[PDB]
Paper text:
The prenylated flavin (prFMN)-dependent ferulic acid decarboxylases (Fdc) catalyse reversible non-oxidative (de)carboxylation of a range of acrylic acids with extended conjugation. The final step in the pathway consists of the decarboxylation of 3-methylcrotonic acid, catalysed by an evolved ferulic acid decarboxylase (Fdc) enzyme. Herein, we report on discovery and optimization through directed evolution of Fdc decarboxylation activity with 3-methylcrotonic acid to produce isobutene. Recently, a reversible 1,3-dipolar cycloaddition mechanism was conclusively shown to underpin catalysis in Aspergillus niger Fdc (AnFdc).
Numbering used by the authors:
A (entry chain A), B (entry chain B): 14 to 510
The structure:
Amino acid sequence: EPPHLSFRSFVNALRQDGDLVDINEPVDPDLEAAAITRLVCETDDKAPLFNNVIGAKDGLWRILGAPASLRSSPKERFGRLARHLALPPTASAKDILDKMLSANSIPPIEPVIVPTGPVKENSIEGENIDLEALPAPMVHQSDGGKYIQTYGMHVIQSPDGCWTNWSIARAMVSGKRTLAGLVISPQHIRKIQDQWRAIGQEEIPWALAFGVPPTAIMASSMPIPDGVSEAGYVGAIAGEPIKLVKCDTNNLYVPANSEIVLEGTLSTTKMAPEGPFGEMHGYVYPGESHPAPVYTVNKITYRNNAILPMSACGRLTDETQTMIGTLAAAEIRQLCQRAGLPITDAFAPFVGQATWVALKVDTHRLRAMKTNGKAFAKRVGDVVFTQKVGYMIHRLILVGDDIDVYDDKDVMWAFATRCRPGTDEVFFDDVPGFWLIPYMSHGNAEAIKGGKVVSDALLTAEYTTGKDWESADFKNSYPKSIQDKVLNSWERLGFKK
Amino acid sequence: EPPHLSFRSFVNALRQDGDLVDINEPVDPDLEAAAITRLVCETDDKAPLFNNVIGAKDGLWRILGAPASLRSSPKERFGRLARHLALPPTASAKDILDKMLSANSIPPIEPVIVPTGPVKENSIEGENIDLEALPAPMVHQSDGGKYIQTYGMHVIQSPDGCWTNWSIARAMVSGKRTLAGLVISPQHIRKIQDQWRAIGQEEIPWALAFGVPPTAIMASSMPIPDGVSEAGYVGAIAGEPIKLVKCDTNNLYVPANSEIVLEGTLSTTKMAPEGPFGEMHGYVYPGESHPAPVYTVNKITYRNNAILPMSACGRLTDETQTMIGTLAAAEIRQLCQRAGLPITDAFAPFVGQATWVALKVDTHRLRAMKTNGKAFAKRVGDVVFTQKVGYMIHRLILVGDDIDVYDDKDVMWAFATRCRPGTDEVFFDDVPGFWLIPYMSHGNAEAIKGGKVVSDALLTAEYTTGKDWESADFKNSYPKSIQDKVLNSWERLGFKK
Ligand SMILES: Cc1cc2c3c(c1C)C(C)(C)C[C@@H](O)N3c1c(nc(O)[nH]c1=O)N2C[C@H](O)[C@H](O)[C@H](O)COP(=O)(O)O
Ligand SMILES: Cc1cc2c3c(c1C)C(C)(C)C[C@@H](O)N3c1c(nc(O)[nH]c1=O)N2C[C@H](O)[C@H](O)[C@H](O)COP(=O)(O)O
Ligand SMILES: [K+]
Ligand SMILES: [K+]
Ligand SMILES: [K+]
Ligand SMILES: [K+]
Ligand SMILES: [Mn+2]
Ligand SMILES: [Mn+2]
């Protein structure tokens, strides 16, 4: 199976690319594996594959850190993400987001069923399960538990049987047979939990699959539409079906070549202390647990030489900024286009810590729409901040089509020089607000409401008569004849290539 | 004479550091010199010394571009600035600003008069002067003239004779014997021009000194207090007097080793078209000239082999971002300390395009005040935004003492995660606004008023009981024993140094 369709084939692709370190020395899953991974993420180094985790037994487990973090080569910065998606290692951020959006305009390719696969090579069942005896990592020193679940796919199906959702949500080991993890509004795992709650089900069939096909984990992190089963969307991205096998203990289906599958139930009735957890915004709050739903594990199936993927998330740059913000930005682009707004591109600048999205405006179309920044900024916020895809994003920055929204430097330049603070901003006090941001849950106003802004970083003339400045930069303040002279002289004179 | 007291010594210091290219090929002062310089600024390369400027005659002139721009090596990033100030090339931005602040708490070292110096080696006088025939650079293609003056020192004295101001303000060639340049409120050149106008003086004695002692050009860019002559401040920074020679044609004094001195008058009545100019925020507006005062030049004196310094300012990173906002931040820190606010440090983040200052708060002292961010942000703005030192700055960001204000990554992390948009901001509609910023002059509200904000990026508990989180980073989320095990294994396992 190709790398985008098999986690094991993806790991070997990173090895072939020289983007993987095989660590064969013993590494402790209590902090050491995550500390190595954290420093990889903070330095854009090669992904670490821990082949000798202390406490591993009977094939459970190796650990892959930083599975979708950045490479240090500028020309292949996004290559570990590209290897999730059948793209070359030189793919741009736009190429990745365009590929993830490509399935929203074409028929799903429905999964196919196989009778077995590598995920059935080994099993542990019932009273033989002891989750506290497995090498689940301690990911940050002040976490409230061992976060086994930082890069697996939760599988949960609606009561009518017709919608099966795939998504990432954190979970930690809470006991011999239990996890606790976030099941928050407005996420689909919570929407489906509440559908079951409403018909009186206490324990919902559930599976959690680790080391799924890489296209599948990318869709699991993307807010594709309500009621759309990720499996068919993934098939459409890949141009071929995902091969699924039925769980042994329930009627759910998991990718046949998953590394590790947990089969069990998600409760509607029981919660347990969950967290704290070093999170996507770069914070942990020591001692601060909150109740979250209980998952019960009834069977584990796994591949020979199974690998658990791990996101050691926190300060820049890890999967929470390369995937959560960016895939939300992709869906916000789509939503703005479907609302009729003249948006060509969107990205989640790394500087914004997954809380900002920059929206690139087709200014020719903007001028034809005969509006103004104050009206336009309010309309954009009303469109985006009242939808699920806008939930995690607190600042939208509108920029014209001379700004590369995929380049944080261009976004900051435009923000700092084109948006008059206050005057050119529309603030949103009444929309859902993302409590996990420290200025929300640990701030001065309601943790779950408001705290959002649309920043109009289009200059006034961009709405009316057009761009009337020239950038004071090498590209725009010198004619081509002068630029060519300089570029042809540069290295001969003694300047750096 | 050492590099901080002689521009010629400073040029040799840059050559010795491997931070200067001697360009001996012919370079056109019409755009080509500035295009080279611009590309050096955008890529942090070596300073260009143009030894063969097309049209140079009679020893006028060589050009040094990028005199205070950044070096590419992380360990010596500010080295070219440090060589202005007798600091090592490894000096931090904080070391530079602390050195510039060092003189407002020691007595001035008054200049000493010498009967002659290298600046008297050559002269051109009266009708022999033709400023249009000199190789003044065209710095950007859409500029309104040849900006001879981007990095020289204007010398002007008050009517009482007690205050001689040294400052940088742009000027372009306007005619055979004239320059036109910005003389704007609230700058000291304009305060002094207005003092002369009020007593009826038509032509004010003036000089412009190019290639001044590097300590002198740093103080020329710093907003030291009203009525304080830069010369004694400069002496205090340098630990000894600047040697000054009297002008031939007026009673002003210039540094004796200056490269080039123009002597003449600044008019209180005469105006000429001035600008546009590719400016510190990254913009030029083609065709947008505005009347500015006229300088008349009656004598030019200059060194053998004279060098004209040139700032090809615009997009990051050039002298307008290494010097203007940074030296303003230094003075804003001291203003806040005199006001009794608990500020320890200040810097102008590069991302803010010289419109942002981050203020570091002593959180122990803050907690003793028993205040809140909303009240505190208002007080800080009310102090800073009604003072000259705060004029060019539109956004102040308040951060706690776990944030390195000299590190744009830490400032952006704090701003994005600790300041709830709108809720945690105080907007200032009535204070003087810096019209040069595009969102002011070419924006939606008054060009000269408002558009300012103080952003409270302290979390709520920082005002009350203290910091209650831990960063989710390598430094703070893993014990020292684990960090050391990782750092000791890092290269042996196959990670990058
Ligand atoms: C890539 C990725 C995504 C997420 C998370 C992580 C990673 C690495 C953690 C490291 C585990 C941190 C955690 O906070 N986490 C997380 C989370 N969404 C939550 O509801 N809960 C979570 O705990 N998302 C985001 C969701 O995966 C997306 O919002 C997705 O769109 C949801 O799918 P759906 O509900 O739209 O189907
Ligand atoms: C370092 C530097 C400083 C300045 C400028 C430049 C450089 C390189 C130009 C490239 C020429 C661009 C130009 O816009 N420019 C400039 C200017 N101030 C002005 O009133 N007018 C200007 O045209 N400053 C800033 C002033 O030098 C400082 O604000 C200083 O504090 C003033 O001295 P004072 O009035 O406080 O004595
Ligand atoms: K999903
Ligand atoms: K605007
Ligand atoms: K000055
Ligand atoms: K705050
Ligand atoms: Mn979904
Ligand atoms: Mn002054």
